[PDB]
């Protein structure tokens, strides 16, 4: 097949995984010191689609308004994932408790998933791809990417 045929077929497979919301090969588990996390129940290969980071897609101005509201309740956690798409900044706000698993994945600077932007007809989606082979039973982890001194002081696990 031509490189272009391979790319089109591959894109269609990812679009179908995003559209269907199929979240196979994973389960919630309690992780020591981290609250809930997600563990692989099957073997993943490097480059395999893992899961969407799914929540409410909003623009940066609306995200800042929601941060002010969430800050009124210290019992509410941190699920806002900021990113650039073309010339604007957006946020996937996954604060609301749903059945989706991407929002339950914990942080590591030396994890096994990499976040990628995948657009479908001009709508951005944040997806997690395996950055290496993942053994069944491993906790899924990615780098949250927050290097702020204030964040690290309040959440020391961001250092590793």
């Amino acid at each position: 097949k031509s490189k272009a045929e391979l790319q089109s077929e591959e894109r269609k497979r990812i679009d179908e995984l995003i559209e269907s919301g199929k979240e196979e090969g994973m389960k919630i588990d309690l992780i020591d010191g981290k609250g809930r996390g997600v563990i692989a129940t099957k073997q993943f290969s490097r480059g395999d689609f893992v899961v969407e980071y799914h929540g409410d897609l909003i623009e940066i101005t609306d995200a800042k308004k929601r941060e002010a509201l969430y800050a009124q309740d210290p019992s509410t956690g941190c699920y806002m994932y900021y990113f650039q798409y073309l010339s604007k900044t957006y946020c996937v706000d996954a604060t609301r408790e749903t059945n989706r698993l991407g929002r339950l994945i914990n942080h590591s600077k030396s994890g096994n998933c990499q976040t990628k932007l995948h657009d479908i007809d001009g709508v951005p989606h944040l997806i997690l791809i395996a950055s290496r082979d993942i053994a069944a039973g491993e906790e899924l982890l990615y780098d949250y990417g927050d290097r702020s001194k204030a964040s690290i002081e309040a959440h020391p696990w961001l250092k590793h």
Partner: peptide, 8 residues
């Protein structure tokens, strides 16, 4: 104090 997640 809240942290964020950022796609760098």
């Amino acid at each position: 104090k809240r942290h964020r997640l950022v796609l760098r």
